[PDB]
Every structure is written in structure tokens, then in C-alpha cells.
Design a protein around this ligand. Structure first.
Ligand SMILES: *[C@@H]1O[C@H](CO)[C@@H](O[C@@H]2O[C@H](CO)[C@@H](O[C@@H]3O[C@H](CO)[C@@H](O)[C@H](O[C@H]4O[C@H](CO)[C@@H](O)[C@H](O)[C@@H]4O[C@H]4O[C@H](CO)[C@@H](O)[C@H](O)[C@@H]4O)[C@@H]3O)[C@H](O)[C@H]2NC(C)=O)[C@H](O)[C@H]1NC(C)=O
Ligand SMILES: *[C@@H]1O[C@H](CO)[C@@H](O[C@@H]2O[C@H](CO)[C@@H](O[C@@H]3O[C@H](CO)[C@@H](O)[C@H](O[C@H]4O[C@H](CO)[C@@H](O)[C@H](O)[C@@H]4O[C@H]4O[C@H](CO)[C@@H](O)[C@H](O)[C@@H]4O)[C@@H]3O)[C@H](O)[C@H]2NC(C)=O)[C@H](O)[C@H]1NC(C)=O
Ligand SMILES: Cc1cc2nc3c(=O)[nH]c(=O)nc-3n(C[C@H](O)[C@H](O)[C@H](O)COP(=O)(O)OP(=O)(O)OC[C@H]3O[C@@H](n4cnc5c(N)ncnc54)[C@H](O)[C@@H]3O)c2cc1C
Ligand SMILES: Cc1cc2nc3c(=O)[nH]c(=O)nc-3n(C[C@H](O)[C@H](O)[C@H](O)COP(=O)(O)OP(=O)(O)OC[C@H]3O[C@@H](n4cnc5c(N)ncnc54)[C@H](O)[C@@H]3O)c2cc1C
Ligand SMILES: *[C@@H]1O[C@H](CO)[C@@H](O[C@@H]2O[C@H](CO)[C@@H](O)[C@H](O)[C@H]2NC(C)=O)[C@H](O)[C@H]1NC(C)=O
Ligand SMILES: *[C@@H]1O[C@H](CO)[C@@H](O[C@@H]2O[C@H](CO)[C@@H](O)[C@H](O)[C@H]2NC(C)=O)[C@H](O)[C@H]1NC(C)=O
Ligand SMILES: *[C@@H]1O[C@H](CO)[C@@H](O)[C@H](O)[C@H]1NC(C)=O
Ligand SMILES: *[C@@H]1O[C@H](CO)[C@@H](O)[C@H](O)[C@H]1NC(C)=O
Ligand SMILES: *[C@@H]1O[C@H](CO)[C@@H](O)[C@H](O)[C@H]1NC(C)=O
Ligand SMILES: *[C@@H]1O[C@H](CO)[C@@H](O)[C@H](O)[C@H]1NC(C)=O
Lengths: 587, 587
């Protein structure tokens, strides 16, 4: 990594709210994150469309290594670029922190840069199970390829374990992708891990952009040729910020959507934005207001605007405009870490990802886990609804059956074991397919206080705890197994904190105390049929409203066995097309 | 509590940075918290003194119950009024959150409202040991009384356990103080606790405003007659915000102090403030720049400005202007909670505080603890300096000896067991007098990124851990002892998480995993002689600089066996007098 030249984009953007207050744009986008900027860029390709992006943070892509270098991952946490949202006290009786980016590019500023794609069956379920017409793998694959420009791996990258299936990578898109390569010798552990699991009959070197992410592979990252993080601002704003029809207001928060009443429901006419209950401004949209503030916030903006569950709104003292199941169905994953020291021979760079299916994760407990899936769905659905994770047991059962189908019938990756080397055998791992459903709701009426109860309800579903415990056990087992054993130089985490012969039950206890949110919450404004409990339709329009869409990570109706940037970019592009279709239909 | 109609002070304050950018004020106060507002109010009593307060947050005193009602304590955590600073990963390998207020009044907006005063010997040591002229109990007692307007407890409050030594309470000051009374029947547990410890020879009903806070008493709160939290904005800004010479810029952060080089060192000439590396402005001070951004932030502002330890500034890429031990010596306390359910008879409202001295805290381990204090000071001092908590072992040993003196010779309260009732026997407790010394340093040069390493170094000193373990055991033991037993309905925390017969060693392991910061960090810019490692002198001037003072919680050179609002108000008043003395000397 070399700190190259960075355009000071911020100095050409707006930071004075009085410059936009009371103005009228075609579209107002709340949140200049992944989806917000993608859509902003696509909308402003048409010179007649004036778009205002209101972003809480600022331009941070020129911050140097802490943002630009993928290898500095994590150092930005705790800075002003980290939203650092606080959850309610979780199952272990501690609040947890939600990492999320604050600044143009949102969480793409601070993420791990892992570039993989969901399983075809997961995206197909959006159309086939959730009724979202056109949201299927074939369509999304095209949009996902359209978003990226992949570079093929070098010889050393291939030898380290990379495997590139050229049919799955777009080569002409906006977001560059390629193998992370920090200049260090390649650790042999990625290959060792592949050799270990391939001896168990686990697929290896499947290209994770191809539709069936399974087994152990090295992955692409969203890095340019200079190994610079291609956050969404760099990809979509940097090239386009001089467009006169694209206005970016930084340092300001959208608090609520402004509506006018029509015969066909509330029509969004603008937003109230600002920084405080007494420092806020109205700004108007001729066409639509697009919420792209991230899955933790977009539901809140709706609730602050009077759209949400009456029970939530009443408690918050917000007059209800529309009853919609906003802020429920939220699905984040639980992450645990199993870390071991690698021998000197195992030193070097490299990450490998193991997308373990149901049986690989559960191993000898597979039969028992299968029995639970086959018999407890109704009970789990009832309990999830009872704790406020969802509102319609029948509709939730559909989701559970969908996940069950994936896990037992479709060989979908259940757990992701993310291995980092750099002198260790470090596994960050998470059960990808939670049965728990969480909630994210406002607690009071002033949007600028941002008083919310963000409750992912981790491990309130027993299967998620078992799944995480089994995945964690698997990481430990894999580390001192087969070819991996050669490089194993002692476990440090849990290390002495958990007996080496730990059973699934002991791992469960350990995991309950030592997990963190995966910070990949989705489905807080679920895009699914209204009858299934959706908040937004297939064009991301909030049901019962006009001129209002939620276009971010709040809308995926399911978790995916993948890193979400790819699908979110594809989703943002698809939604931009829908918005533009509507624009064209108004003359 | 009853929500009354509140004045919208925010609308009369500044939120546009362009309105102050480039102006010259007499004084610029970075941080409109407890000390910042107190000083700003005192300085602007003189109509010719133009003061600018730059506050990161806004006016929040009219937010309703979440701020105004002391009984809503903690609901504000996680909102925009909570700084929610992240520490580095602590001894338990978890980062922890630092609650701190963000808005006019700072942490007085979100605090527990406990109004108690330090021990006379602790304040006397500032002058006697640390060499800070005029900083002694007699002087501070008067200043502390001048800040407050106390109400005597009612008959019911007295019968519940209140006790007042009228000679210690100011009755004409600005911050009202009185018994919290939420209208509920008084729990009998405060009296039961007093009866329990009084059987053991522990003092009860000592007035904790009188100089020797010891034993179990009920305490005053900073509440007006309407039971409204008297935060510092309410007390000092609300009455005075129409002053034409008092300008408050909200929503902006001071990032660094601007200096002009003189013969006698750097002269502060103003500050750079704003919200981002590319969105910031300069504003100038004719007289002085006063840092009052809180003990977690003032040291950082100095470091961002080039004042601090070379090793820190080099790592952060900040050119050093002055080498001073900024951001070390930091002392926060560790808090643990021992919570038990109370029988129905113990129901009701009421808080009681046990200021436990050394022997009461350690009980049977007293002899062993005393041995540690008598023999390990030098070792601890070396180890504290080695881990970066301080820079001069000899000077640190002075602090250690001072603390040892307090504990062993002066009967100073060593641990505070803060009891809440309301259906429980809930003890939040902390060792008040830490031997550990933490650090708080910038990690990079952009102030607006706020990339820092806030490291309280909790439990890196063995005595602190022992002290916290012993205090925690004491809380458990007291709960089911003597008169307390009647109301004891079973422990819930640690409850099953720690065996009921837990030894001190088992408590230590427990405490290590289950503690939180007390959020009372002081001494990050210690007010002590330069030779002892001071950052500011007895008039709060940063050594080696002109026109620059640190006037907040960063400056107390020692922890105090008390809630700090009282002493911080007293300190701010004393510092205001020092500032005005200098103002007068410049014509
Ligand atoms: C906070 O986090 C830090 C950092 O992670 C924790 O500190 C690390 O703690 C781990 C232990 O949990 C420790 O790892 C040991 O390192 C030793 C080298 O100094 C190794 O000898 C040791 O290996 C043995 O134990 C492993 C774990 O059980 C086995 O996997 C391994 O094969 C080894 O087992 C052999 O030896 C043991 C002797 O204990 C014997 O009983 C076995 O049967 C077998 O013969 C560990 O790998 C790290 O060195 C620590 N330090 C750092 C910086 O990493 C700290 O514990 C955490 N604190 C809390 C409160 O959680
Ligand atoms: C997260 O926090 C929640 C909330 O605090 C935790 O849930 C609470 O957990 C505690 C236990 O740790 C539990 O308290 C028990 O409640 C029971 C009633 O429901 C009581 O019967 C029980 O009392 C016995 O145990 C206490 C603790 O040891 C003793 O102090 C007490 O005297 C009792 O012990 C006597 O009785 C038993 C048999 O009854 C005997 O064997 C003993 O030797 C002795 O004679 C506890 O008070 C709370 O009910 C839980 N729930 C709530 C809502 O508070 C949760 O565990 C935490 N989660 C994690 C992961 O840490
Ligand atoms: C720690 C972490 C690691 C991750 N690692 C990976 C990875 O390795 N691979 C991967 O593919 N994905 C990863 N992700 C996920 C990916 O970054 C997110 O899914 C993606 O950025 C979500 O896009 P979005 O548009 O939904 O929201 P975001 O990108 O979060 O953007 C939302 C934007 O809204 C702004 N905002 C918030 N509130 C308001 C308001 N009230 N008004 C105006 N603006 C507001 C925020 O500042 C932000 O810029 C990671 C995310 C995190 C947090
Ligand atoms: C959770 C909690 C509970 C507490 N309970 C009690 C109690 O019960 N009794 C008691 O006596 N004390 C209590 N305190 C302690 C008391 O509230 C604090 O000690 C006191 O407010 C510290 O005053 P200060 O002036 O140092 O800083 P603060 O009051 O914190 O004020 C600092 C101010 O600076 C602002 N600021 C921060 N960074 C910047 C920047 N870069 N530029 C401009 N402004 C900035 C902050 O927004 C804030 O308003 C508690 C504190 C906390 C956090
Ligand atoms: C999960 O993938 C495994 C491959 O790793 C699938 O195949 C079975 O693998 C298990 C152990 O890994 C073996 O016991 C079986 O013998 C394998 N099958 C055959 C035909 O050999 C397994 O089917 C996948 N699970 C699901 C639910 O799809
Ligand atoms: C801690 O306070 C205890 C009281 O709980 C002190 O003990 C009393 O000390 C006085 C002497 O000043 C004696 O007259 C009493 O008989 C003592 N006995 C007890 C156990 O009550 C104790 O001295 C204090 N400890 C320190 C270190 O000051
Ligand atoms: C290659 O990609 C195609 C889709 O284009 C997919 O069908 C096939 O399974 C992929 N193979 C591997 C090994 O990734
Ligand atoms: C509950 O969800 C099921 C499945 O979508 C649906 O058939 C039913 O209409 C929903 N119930 C109501 C009353 O909406
Ligand atoms: C009463 O307060 C005075 C200080 O004003 C103090 O000197 C005296 O000791 C106090 N009395 C008791 C009993 O604490
Ligand atoms: C170390 O501290 C001691 C005690 O204050 C002092 O005498 C000595 O001068 C200090 N520092 C230096 C620079 O040596």
C-alpha cells in the first residue's frame, strides 16, 4: 500500500444546510452509503434529474491508510467514521456496538472488502418465495456483474489458492475487484485448509461469485490495482461529484420524511434533515425520497415519520401515518472468533473463506440439528413473534421453511468461517442463516436524538446458538486437523478460556458470552410481498405510500451466504432502474 | 416528575460555523459541559468579556424526561447526547463504552445526579502534596458551597434515611440540590443498610458534603424543587444565554488550538473547529483558549495541537510543539454490580451510598491488602510507568504514597457502594482510589477523525482488582446480612454466575470479566507541579504555553471519594476567578 493522491472531494460538496434548505430536488436520498451513492450516480446520469444526497458523514475516502488500505481494517472503529451504534443489552446482558460507516460510502468505508456473491437459490427465493418479481439469480447475477470490473489473479495469487471462474466476473463495471495482495509472501495455510477440507470431501476453489458459494476458497476484494479500497464514494461519487445535478450535503442527518395526504396514501414530498430538534430544515422532492441510511436507520426514519407498528409509534409518541411492519424481521449474524498461532512456516498473507453447509458445520450433531429444523419451526416462529422479532407467525414460518429448504435441500452454506493468516490461523466465523428475528425501533419522537432500541435478538433462537457453537467448534477442529495441523502452534482464543475437548454444549455457553454482531443486519424494511410482512415492494416502494422507497440493506428479505456488497450494488442498480422507469412514466 | 414548558435555548444559539469563523473573542471555551459553561457564565458576568463556547452537541435540557427526570437515568445512553466513546480493548479483551454527555451541560445532562463532596484530605493534598497553591479543602469547600442552593430534606426524606449537616450546604448558589423524591413510598432498605453497617461499627448518616464521606448515607442530588435535573446548561446557560457577550456555537468540535510562537513559548491565539478535516474554521481568542471538552477529549485537543509526549505525537504524525505529559496519569474507576431482588416489603424508592474505608472494604483481607500497599508501591509505580500510564516513577510514587496515606492513615473512603432500591437491592460499586494510571492519546493527526486510544488500564494494577473484588464481595455480603437479610429475596447478579461462597480470588476473576468504566476519568491533564508530571498549574494554565488553560475534569490530580460534580463546579469557579484575575491584570 502506498498513500497516493487523493482528490479533496469534500471541499466541492455541500456542508452548509442552508444551501439546500427549502429547495426542491427531483430525488432526495437519505444516506450516501453503498446504495445511496450507487442510486445517486445512476439517477444523475440523466441531466434533468436533480438529486440531493444527504449524508450524515463526510468524504473520507482520502483519509489515507485507515480507509484506503484494506489491511488497516478495524482501525477506523471508534473514530468518527464509525457510527458505533449501541444495541440494547443482548442475551449476554451486555450492550454491543454496531460498526457501520459514517461518511460518503457508508459501511464500504470500513468493511473487510470481501467480495463474494450469494447462493443462486437464496436470490431466487426473493422472487419465488417472497414474491418479488424479477429478483432472481439470473437477473441479479447480471446486475452484480455490471457493478464490477474484476482483474484475474496473478500466478502467486493462484498458487496461494485463488481460483477464478471467468464466466462469473464482470470486467467493465464500476467497482474494481481483485485479489488482495499486501506484498507479503503468501501463507501456505489457505492451501493447507483447502487440502484439509478437500480430504473430507468439501469443495475447494469454487469461485464464490458464481452462485453456489461452498467449501474453501480465496476470495476477491473490492480493491483497485493499487490495492486501494474501492469504497462506494470512490466508485460512484469520485467520478461524478462535479455533475451539476448531483448535490451532496454532508454532515447532516435525515430525520423524517415529509408527506402530503393523497387519496392513495401518504405521498413523500421531502425530508426534514439537520442535526438537532431545533437545528433542522425541510427540503423537498418533486419525485421521490429514497431512504438509504442503512438497515439500522432507514426503519427508524420511517418510524420517526409515522410509518411503523402502532405499538412502537405509540410508545415513541409518534402519530401513526401508516401501520407497516417496519423495523422487525431484522437479521444480523453472530460472529465468534477461534484463533490460533501459526508456526513460522505458516507465516505470510492470505485470507480464505470456508462456506460450510449444514452437515459440514454440524458434523456429528447434524442429525440432531436436522431434527430441530424439521420439528421446531412452528414453535420458533411463535416465539420469535412473541418477542417482537416479527408480527405474523404464518409469514415467519414461510421464511423458516425457506431457510430450512436452503440448509437441508439446497446445500446452501450455513456458516462462514473466515480465515485470516498473517502469522495466525484466525477464524472469524458466523452462522449465516439466523432463525432469530430482531427489531430496530425508535423509542421517542425526536429523530435527532436517535433514541432507538436496536435489538438483533441474537441467540434468542436456540438453533442460531447451536449453529454458532458448531461452527466455532468446527473452526477449532479444522485448525489442528489434516494439513492444518502442520501450521498449528497453539490456540489463543478461546485458548484456555474453553477446554480443548469442549462439547457443543460448552461451546454454546462460550459463544453466548463471546460473540459480537456480524454487523450485517438486513431485512429491517423487508422487501417481500405485503402479505408476507414486507415493508417495500419489488421496486423498493414502501407499501401504501407514494414517492418513498427504501433502497439499502434494510430491504433484502433474507440473509445471504455471502458478503453483501456485491448483491447490494446489484440491488442498488436494479432499484435505480426501477426508479428511472417510474421517472420516465411521469413524462 | 412533570414535563413543564421549556425554553428553546437552542434557537438563540449559533449552529452556523460561518457566523463565528474568523471572529475574535476574548475567550474561547472548547466544550460547553460542566466546567465550560460554569466558566463561560462567570466570565460573561463582565459585559465587556466576549466569550465563545464551542460545543460539540446542542441544547438538550428541554428534551423532556429523558434528560430532565433523574429517574430516567441511563435511557439517554446510546442517543446522540451520549458521546459513547470507545476504549481500547481492556484487560478482559473487550472494548468498553465511555458514557459522556454530548450537548450543553456535557455529562451533567446524562449523569446520576449524585451530589456528594470529596474528603477534605484529598483536596488538601492538591495543595499540600501536588503543590497547587490555594487548592485545599477550606478554599474548595467555600467554592463548592457557593455553587449550590440546597434544600433541607422533608420529614419523610429524613425518616427514610436522609441526614443533613446544615453547615455544609450552600443555600444561595446556582445549582440547586435536594433529596431526590420520585413520589413513591420510601424503601426501608436504606435504613436497613444503615442499621446493618452501624451494627458493624460503620458510620451512618454522615453528611457527604461535609468533608469526610464515610459510611452509609442517603445523598443530595442536583435537582430543583420540581425534581428536575439541574444540568450545567440549566444552571449556568439557561439564565444567561441572552447575554450579548456570551456566544455559544453548537454542533461543532474544537479540533486543535492555534498557536503563535513567542519568546516565552507557544501562545494560544484561537482554535480550529468544525466537523471534518475539510470542514473546519479558525476562530481567535484575544485572551485565552480554555479547554473544557472533558477528560477524554481535552488531552487529545492538546495532542492534536502538538502538545504531548513525543512518542505519541510521532506515532500520530503530529509535529510536536511542546513536550508535556498530556494524556497520561488518567484515573477512572472500575464499576461492578451486585444486584439482588428485594422482598415486597423492601419496595419503594431510595438510593443509599456506602463510602467504605479500607478496612470495611477489605474486611478479613485487610492485613494482606495493607501489606501490598506497604511493600509494592515502588513496583507498581515502575509497572505503571512501563505500561505508559505515567512517565516518571518517582513522581508517580508520590501519588501512590499520597493514596496510601489516605487509605491507611486518613480513614478515606476507598470504595463506594451505590445502592439503588426500587424493588431491588442493587449495588453499583467501585474502588474509588485506583493505583492504575491510564492514558488517552490521539492515534493520527486529523482531529476530526477523533482516532484515539482511550485506555484506562483498568485492573493492570493488582490492588485495583483486589479492591474491586473485595468491594464486590462486600456488596454481596451486606445484602444478606443483619437487617438487610429481611429484604433479601435472592441475588440476580452475579447470581448463578458466581458461587455464593465465592472467595476474593473467585470474585477477582468475576470482576475482571464483568466490570465497566465508572466514567469518572480524571487526571488526563493533571493539575500538579510540573516536576510531579503536571500538565497544568494551579491556575489551570498549560505549562510552557500562554493563553491556554485546561479547565475540566482532565485536571484534578487525584481521584476523589465522591461524585465529582460538586468539586468540578467548585474547581470551575476557582479557575474562573483565576482567569478573571489575569484578565484584570491585562488592563
Ligand atoms: C485476552 O486475549 C489474550 C490474547 O488472545 C489472551 O492471552 C493469550 O491467552 C492464550 C491462552 O488462552 C495464550 O495462548 C497460549 O500460549 C502459550 C504460549 O505462551 C501456549 O503454550 C498455549 O498452548 C497450549 O494451549 C493451547 C490452548 O489450550 C493449545 O491449543 C495448545 O496446543 C497448547 O497446549 C499444550 O500446552 C498446554 C499448556 O497450557 C497443555 O495444558 C496442553 O495439554 C498441551 O500440552 C496457548 O496457545 C496466549 O499466549 C496469550 N497471549 C497472547 C498475547 O495471545 C488472554 O488470555 C485473554 N484474556 C481473557 C481474560 O480472556
Ligand atoms: C442476564 O441477566 C439476567 C437478569 O439478571 C439473568 O437472569 C437472572 O438470573 C438470576 C440467576 O443468576 C435469577 O435469579 C434467581 O431467581 C430465582 C427466582 O426466579 C431465585 O430462586 C434465585 O435465588 C437463588 O439463587 C440466588 C443466587 O445464587 C441466591 O442468592 C438465593 O438465595 C437463592 O439460592 C437459594 O436457593 C436455591 C434453591 O432455590 C439453593 O440451591 C441455594 O443454595 C440457596 O438456598 C435467584 O435469585 C433471575 O431470576 C434471572 N432472571 C431475571 C429476570 O432476573 C441471566 O442469567 C443473565 N444471563 C447471563 C448469560 O449471564
Ligand atoms: C464492519 C463491517 C464489515 C463489513 N465487511 C464487509 C465485507 O467484507 N464485504 C461486504 O461485501 N460487505 C461488508 N460489509 C457490509 C457492507 O459494507 C454493507 O452491507 C453496506 O455498506 C450496506 O450499504 P447501505 O447502502 O445499506 O448502507 P451504508 O453503506 O451503511 O450506508 C448508509 C449511509 O447512511 C448514512 N446515514 C446514516 N444515518 C443517516 C441519516 N439519518 N441521514 C443521512 N444519512 C445517514 C451513513 O452515514 C452511511 O453513509 C461490512 C459492513 C461492516 C459494518
Ligand atoms: C454516566 C455518568 C454518570 C455520572 N454520574 C455522576 C453523578 O451521579 N454525580 C456527579 O457528581 N458526577 C457524575 N458524573 C460526572 C460528571 O457528569 C462529569 O464529571 C462532569 O460533567 C465532567 O465535566 P467536564 O466539564 O469535565 O466535562 P463534560 O461535562 O463532559 O463536558 C465536556 C463537553 O465538551 C463537549 N465536547 C467534547 N468534545 C468536544 C470538542 N472537540 N469540541 C467542543 N466541545 C466538545 C462535550 O459535548 C461536552 O458537552 C457522571 C458522568 C457520567 C458520564
Ligand atoms: C454438505 O456438503 C457435504 C460435502 O461436504 C455433502 O456430502 C456429504 O458429506 C458428508 C460429510 O461431509 C458425507 O458424510 C456424505 O457421505 C457426503 N455425501 C456423499 C454422497 O458422499 C452433504 O450432502 C451436504 N449437506 C447438505 C445438507 O446438502
Ligand atoms: C475504617 O473504619 C473502621 C470503622 O468501620 C475503623 O475502625 C474503628 O476505628 C476506630 C479508631 O479510629 C476505633 O475506635 C473503632 O473501634 C474501630 N473499630 C471497628 C472495627 O469498628 C478503621 O480504623 C478504619 N480503617 C482505616 C484504615 O482507617
Ligand atoms: C463457474 O461459474 C459457472 C457460472 O458461470 C458455475 O456454473 C460453475 O459452477 C462455476 N465453477 C466453479 C468451480 O466455480
Ligand atoms: C400472515 O401471513 C400469511 C402468510 O403471508 C398470510 O397468508 C396472512 O394474510 C397474514 N395475516 C394477515 C392477517 O395479514
Ligand atoms: C458538619 O459539617 C462541618 C463542616 O461544615 C464539619 O466540620 C463537621 O464535622 C460536620 N459534622 C458531622 C457530624 O459530620
Ligand atoms: C521525576 O519526578 C520527581 C518527583 O517529582 C522529580 O524530582 C524529577 O525531577 C522528575 N523528572 C525528571 C525530568 O527527572
Amino acid at each position: 500500500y502506498l498513500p497516493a493522491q487523493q482528490i479533496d472531494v469534500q471541499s466541492s460538496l455541500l456542508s452548509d444546510p442552508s444551501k439546500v434548505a427549502g429547495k426542491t430536488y427531483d430525488y432526495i436520498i437519505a444516506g450516501g452509503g453503498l446504495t445511496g451513492l450507487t442510486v445517486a450516480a445512476k439517477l444523475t446520469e440523466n441531466p434533468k434529474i436533480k438529486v440531493l444526497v444527504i449524508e450524515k458523514g463526510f468524504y473520507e475516502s482520502n483519509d489515507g491508510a485507515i480507509i484506503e488500505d484494506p489491511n488497516a481494517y478495524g482501525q477506523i472503529f471508534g473514530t468518527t467514521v464509525d457510527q458505533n451504534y449501541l444495541t440494547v443489552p443482548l442475551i449476554n446482558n451486555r450492550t454491543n456496538n454496531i460498526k457501520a460507516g459514517k461518511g460518503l460510502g457508508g459501511s464500504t468505508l470500513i468493511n473487510g472488502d470481501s467480495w463474494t456473491r450469494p447462493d443462486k437459490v437464496q436470490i431466487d427465493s426473493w422472487e419465488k418465495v417472497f414474491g418479488m418479481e424479477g429478483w432472481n439469480w439470473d437477473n441479479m447475477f447480471e446486475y452484480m456483474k455490471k457493478a464490477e470490473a474484476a482483474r484475474t489473479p496473478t500466478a502467486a495469487q493462484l498458487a496461494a489458492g485463488h481460483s477464478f471462474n471467468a464466466t462469473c466476473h464482470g470486467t467493465n463495471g464500476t467497482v474494481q475487484s481483485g485479489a488482495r495482495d499486501n506484498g507479503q509472501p503468501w501463507s501456505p495455510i489457505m492451501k493447507a485448509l483447502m487440502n484439509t477440507v478437500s480430504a473430507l470431501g468439501v469443495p475447494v476453489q469454487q469461485d464464490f461469485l458464481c452462485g453456489h458459494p461452498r467449501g474453501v476458497s480465496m476470495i476477491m476484494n473490492n480493491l483497485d490495482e493499487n490495492q486501494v479500497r474501492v469504497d462506494a464514494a470512490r466508485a460512484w461519487l469520485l467520478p461524478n461529484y462535479q455533475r451539476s445535478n448531483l448535490e451532496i450535503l454532508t454532515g447532516q442527518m435525515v430525520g423524517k420524511v415529509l408527506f402530503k395526504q393523497t387519496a392513495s396514501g401518504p405521498q413523500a414530498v421531502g425530508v426534514n434533515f439537520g442535526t438537532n430538534k431545533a437545528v433542522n430544515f425541510d427540503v423537498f422532492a418533486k419525485h421521490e425520497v429514497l431512504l438509504a441510511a442503512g438497515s439500522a436507520i432507514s426503519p427508524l426514519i420511517l418510524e420517526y415519520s409515522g410509518i411503523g407498528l402502532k405499538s412502537v409509534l405509540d410508545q415513541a409518541n409518534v402519530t401513526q401515518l401508516l401501520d407497516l411492519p417496519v423495523g422487525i424481521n431484522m437479521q444480523d449474524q453472530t460472529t465468534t472468533t477461534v484463533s490460533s498461532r501459526a508456526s513460522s512456516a505458516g507465516a505470510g498473507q492470505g485470507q480464505a473463506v470456508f462456506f460450510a453447509n449444514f452437515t459440514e458445520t454440524f458434523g456429528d450433531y447434524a442429525p440432531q440439528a436436522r431434527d430441530l429444523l424439521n420439528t421446531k419451526l412452528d414453535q420458533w416462529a411463535e416465539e420469535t413473534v412473541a418477542r417482537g422479532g416479527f408480527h405474523n407467525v404464518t409469514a415467519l414460518k414461510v421464511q423458516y421453511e425457506n431457510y430450512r429448504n436452503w440448509l437441508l435441500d439446497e446445500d446452501v452454506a450455513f456458516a462462514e468461517l473466515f480465515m485470516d493468516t498473517e502469522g495466525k490461523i484466525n477464524f472469524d466465523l458466523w452462522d449465516l442463516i439466523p432463525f432469530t428475528r430482531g427489531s430496530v425501533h425508535i423509542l421517542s419522537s425526536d429523530p435527532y436524538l436517535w433514541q432507538f432500541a436496536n435489538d438483533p435478538k441474537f441467540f434468542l433462537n436456540e438453533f442460531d446458538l447451536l449453529g454458532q457453537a458448531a461452527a466455532s467448534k468446527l473452526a477449532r477442529d479444522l485448525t489442528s486437523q489434516g494439513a492444518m495441523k502442520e501450521y498449528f502452534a497453539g490456540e489463543t482464543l478461546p485458548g484456555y478460556n474453553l477446554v480443548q475437548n469442549a462439547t457443543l454444549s460448552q461451546w454454546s455457553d462460550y459463544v453466548l458470552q463471546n460473540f459480537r454482531p456480524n454487523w450485517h443486519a438486513v431485512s429491517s424494511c423487508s422487501m417481500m410481498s405485503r402479505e408476507l410482512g414486507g415493508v417495500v415492494d419489488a421496486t423498493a416502494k414502501v407499501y401504501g405510500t407514494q414517492g418513498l422507497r427504501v433502497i439499502d440493506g434494510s430491504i433484502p428479505p433474507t440473509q445471504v451466504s455471502s458478503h453483501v456488497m456485491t448483491i447490494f450494488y446489484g440491488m442498488a442498480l436494479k432499484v435505480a432502474d426501477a426508479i428511472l422507469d417510474d421517472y420516465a412514466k411521469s413524462a
